[PDB]
Amino acid sequence: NAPLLLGKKAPNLYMTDTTGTYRYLYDVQAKYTILFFWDSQCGHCQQETPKLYDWWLKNRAKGIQVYAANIERKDEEWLKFIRSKKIGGWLNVRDSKNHTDFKITYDIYATPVLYVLDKNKVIIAKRIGYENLDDFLVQYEKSLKTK
Numbered sequence: 001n002a003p004l005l006l007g008k009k010a011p012n013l014y015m016t017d018t019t020g021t022y023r024y025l026y027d028v029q030a031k032y033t034i035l036f037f038w039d040s041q042c043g044h045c046q047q048e049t050p051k052l053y054d055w056w057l058k059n060r061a062k063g064i065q066v067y068a069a070n071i072e073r074k075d076e077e078w079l080k081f082i083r084s085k086k087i088g089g090w091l092n093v094r095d096s097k098n099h100t101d102f103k104i105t106y107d108i109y110a111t112p113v114l115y116v117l118d119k120n121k122v123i124i125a126k127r128i129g130y131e132n133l134d135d136f137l138v139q140y141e142k143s144l145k146t147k
Contacts, residue, residue: 015093031063040081
């Protein structure tokens with residue numbers, strides 16, 4: 001695996017939603033997709049996940065989905081976190097059908113990890129913090145105009 005690059009299509013993910021039903025990354029329709037890899041075992045009070053959710057609630061009508069890719073190999077703790085932290089509204093998925101190698105394909109070590117993708121799943125931001133999203137989207141859109 002070569003490391004991921006700006007301007008390349010993010011690798012597809014064949015992950016499943018909270019009902020166990022396939023929701024492929026490439027099948028998501030959204031002006032921007034936030035690809036977000038996370039792990040409930042990082043703690044019940046982990047900060048990035050619910051704060052991104054709060055951000056998403058405020059910005060989603062702009063045409064933004066979060067493909068919230070939980071990296072765990074069991075359902076129980078993932079679902080418990082979704083319920084208790086009340087983050088069920090976005091696209092929660094897990095690799096329940098074993099199609100994703102998070103280390104080879106996406107280089108996931110420490111979690112959480114965030115990518116911003118455009119409408120065609122091209123990588124436009126790599127591993128930036130949720131707190132830099134608003135500014136990243138402003139500058140990105142200005143950059144489309146200039147040229």
